[PDB]
Amino acid sequence: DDKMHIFVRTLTGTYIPLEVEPSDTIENVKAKIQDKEGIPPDQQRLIFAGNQLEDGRTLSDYNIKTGSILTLVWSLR
Amino acid sequence: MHIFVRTLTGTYIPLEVEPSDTIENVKAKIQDKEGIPPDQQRLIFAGNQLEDRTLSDYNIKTGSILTLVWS
Amino acid sequence: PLGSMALKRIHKELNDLARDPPAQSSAGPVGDDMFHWQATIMGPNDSPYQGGVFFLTIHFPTDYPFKPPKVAFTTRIYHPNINSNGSICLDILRSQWSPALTISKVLLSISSLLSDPNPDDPLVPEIARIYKTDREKYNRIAREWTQKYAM
Numbered sequence: 194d195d196k197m198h199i200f201v202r203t204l205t206g207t208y209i210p211l212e213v214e215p216s217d218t219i220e221n222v223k224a225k226i227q228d229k230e231g232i233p234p235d236q237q238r239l240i241f242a243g244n245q246l247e248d249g250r251t252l253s254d255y256n257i258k259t260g261s262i263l264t265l266v267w268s269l270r
Numbered sequence: 271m272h273i274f275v276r277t278l279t280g281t282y283i284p285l286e287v288e289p290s291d292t293i294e295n296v297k298a299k300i301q302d303k304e305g306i307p308p309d310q311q312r313l314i315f316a317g318n319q320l321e322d323r324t325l326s327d328y329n330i331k332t333g334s335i336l337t338l339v340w341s
Numbered sequence: 342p343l344g345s346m347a348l349k350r351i352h353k354e355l356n357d358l359a360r361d362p363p364a365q366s367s368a369g370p371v372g373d374d375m376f377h378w379q380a381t382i383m384g385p386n387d388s389p390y391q392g393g394v395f396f397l398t399i400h401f402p403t404d405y406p407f408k409p410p411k412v413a414f415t416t417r418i419y420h421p422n423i424n425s426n427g428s429i430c431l432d433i434l435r436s437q438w439s440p441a442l443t444i445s446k447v448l449l450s451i452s453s454l455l456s457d458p459n460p461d462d463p464l465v466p467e468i469a470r471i472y473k474t475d476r477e478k479y480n481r482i483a484r485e486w487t488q489k490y491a492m
Contacts, residue, residue: 194342195343197343198343198345198348200352200375202370206359208352208355208370208375210348210352241373242373259343259344259345259348260344260348260374260375260376261373261374261375262370262372262373262374262375263373
């Protein structure tokens with residue numbers, strides 16, 4: 194039950210809360226973002242600590258912890 | 271990289287910049303997005319006013335948020 | 342559950358501030374951590390800080406709102422209750438903090454402290470001394486500092 198609660202900041206101003214695991218992949222987070230907000234995964238770019246979160250890597254690989262805020266860019270559409 | 275400028279009203283302005291860019295041509299970049307002339311804008315990062323140094327020395331990276339003040 | 346109990350309240354407060362801000366202050370996270378917020382306060386008109394925009398940092402404890410947040414000025418200000426490190430003496434930030442107190446109320450209390458300082462029970466003894474002995478000098482110095490650091 195050691196799930197961490199993180200947030201996704203959009204350019205609209207909202208913050209989407211997500212209950213995730215450290216082993217969740219970036220594409221899994223994008224799928225959750227699509228489910229909650231509708232943005233297609235292939236048009237999402239996630240930024241955290243000045244890094245573009247690449248697919249296949251996990252949140253733990255970027256030291257994403259409870260209360261982390263990931264900036265979402267809705268580009269290429 | 272990509273940086274974001276937030277006004278006190280909450281609106282966001284995304285800019286495509288590089289660490290070599292100084293902040294006065296960044297100010298000018300904000301000028302032709304919503305109409306604020308450079309003479310009436312204050313750029314603040316991490317609570318410190320930015321004087322027209324470059325983005326690299328203030329440690330501005332991708333996703334960085336800068337507060338815009340109409341002064 | 343870690344500190345999710347605090348994060349629920351923090352997100353709710355952020356939503357409340359975004360939907361209805363006081364228009365004389367603002368608050369929200371500008372970084373990568375929901376526990377760390379930036380706030381801005383407009384200087385009151387009835388104070389020598391009129392026209393200045395003061396930036397503050399808010400650090401939420403992991404068990405918010407049971408413990409108060411750590412609020413500190415980042416813009417330099419000339420005030421007998423705010424030291425050179427930005428610490429604020431409000432008596433509701435460590436001693437009489439109760440749940441159901443919001444960040445918005447903390448901002449309003451800080452604005453009121455800016456409007457009417459507290460000579461006795463000071464944080465900076467010298468500024469309090471000048472405030473008690475010469476009001477014109479204090480107001481002029483505060484205006485100079487507001488023009489230099491908050492404008």
